[PDB]
Amino acid sequence: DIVMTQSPLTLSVTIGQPASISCKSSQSLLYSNGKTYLSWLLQRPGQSPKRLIYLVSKLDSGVPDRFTGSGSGTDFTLKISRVEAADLGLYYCVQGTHFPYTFGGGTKLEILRADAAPTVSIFPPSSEQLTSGGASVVCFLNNFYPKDINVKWKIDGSERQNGVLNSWTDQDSKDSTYSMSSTLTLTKDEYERHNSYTCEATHKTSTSPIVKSFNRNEC
Amino acid sequence: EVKLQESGAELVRPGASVKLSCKTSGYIFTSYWIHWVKQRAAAGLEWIARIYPGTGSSYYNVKFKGKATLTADKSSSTAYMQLSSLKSDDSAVYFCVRWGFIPVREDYVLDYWGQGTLVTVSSAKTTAPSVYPLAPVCGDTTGSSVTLGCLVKGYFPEPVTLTWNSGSLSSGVHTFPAVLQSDLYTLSSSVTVTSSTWPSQSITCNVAHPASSTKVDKKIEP
C-alpha cells in the first residue's frame, strides 16, 4: 500500500498568521487519465472528518478560501493564509490513485495563545462515597495554556503517586485553553487516617507551583 | 437534505459479529457509492470498503477481506456493514460516508458523513455508575465565582451523558473524557457559576447511562 507521510505531526500557530502542512506519498499519485486524486480532510474535536479539498486543489462548497492546496507527483501542501480559532483540529491527506485508499497520519493544529495560569480547585470525598467505604479527592485545573502541566498529590506532606487518575480535555475553540482533572482514590479508612490533602500544579506560568489544599479535621 | 443516520454504540463479545447500519435520506440511494471508514483512538483513519447500492457491487481493502461484509437494502435506503471474528483491537468508531466522487464523471459532489458508531469489543459486563456531588471545602475560587463538580465512577461500557440543570447550564462547564481503569470508567465534570447563583439556587448534575438504563440526578448542596 502507498504510505502517506505528513509533517509536522503537530503545529502551534497564532491566530491571524499563516500555516502550511505537507504530505508525501511513497509513489506518484498521477493517474493515467491525468488526474491526481489527493484530498485533504479536517476533523474538528468531537466531529466526523470533512473534506476541504479534492483533486489536489479544488475546494469543496461551504469552505472559506483561506485554504489552498498544491503539489504534484509525490509532494503536496495545504496552506492556510490566515489561521482562525475554528481551524483547530486534525488534518489528513488521503490518496485514491492507488487501491486500497490510504490516509496520512495526521497533523494536529493547535492555536498558540498567550500563557494562562490554571484556576485550581480541590474537593474532599462526598459523604455518599465514604458511605461506600471509598474516598476520591478531586482536583480541577481549568483554563490554562500551554498544555504542559504537572500535578502532585501530597498527603500530610508526603507525595502519593499511586491511585491517581488524570484526564485532559482537548483545546477549547472558544478560548484556546485546556483543562485537566486529577482524581486520587483511597479507601475510606486510609482517608480518615490523614490530615491534609494537597494538589500542586507546576506550569510554565510561574516558578512557584499553585497549591490548593484542605485539612480534614471534623465538622 | 442529505442525512446519514448511523446505529447506536455497540458492546460486542469477542468472536461475535456486529451488523452496523447507515440509514440514508435526501438523495437517490442507488446513485452513489457508500464508503466505510474506521477510526481508532489514535488519530488514525482507515478505508475499509465501498458499495454501489444500485448493483450491489462492492470493493474491499484486503486488510478487511473476510472481516467486513457490505450489504444494502434498496427499499429502506440503508447500507450495512457486518464485522465478524471480533477482537479487542476492532473496538473503534466506524463511519459510513457518501463520499461524492462520481466515477463516470471523474468529478466530485459534496461528502456527507454519518455520525459514527462506536463499537466496544469486550467481555466485561455492563455496570451502572455511582454519581457523587463535588461541593467545595477549600478549593473553590470562593469570592466572585465558585466551581462545583460531579464525579461519575465505576461504569461500563461507554458512553455516559452528563449535563447540568438539564443542559440549561452550558457556559463554564468542562466535562473530562472518561478514563478506563480495570474494566471500569471514571468521568468528571466541573461547573463554575457566580457566588450569587449557588447556593441561592439549585444546581444539579444529570447523568444517564443507557447501557444500564440508569438515569440519576444529583443536587450539589453546601
Ligand SMILES: O=C(O)CNC(=O)CCCP(=O)(O)OCc1ccc([N+](=O)[O-])cc1
Ligand atoms: O480505484 C482505483 O484503483 C482508481 N482510483 C479511482 O478510481 C478514484 C478514487 C478517487 P477518490 O474518491 O479520491 O478515492 C479516495 C478516497 C475514497 C473515499 C474516502 N473516504 O474517506 O471515504 C477517502 C479517499
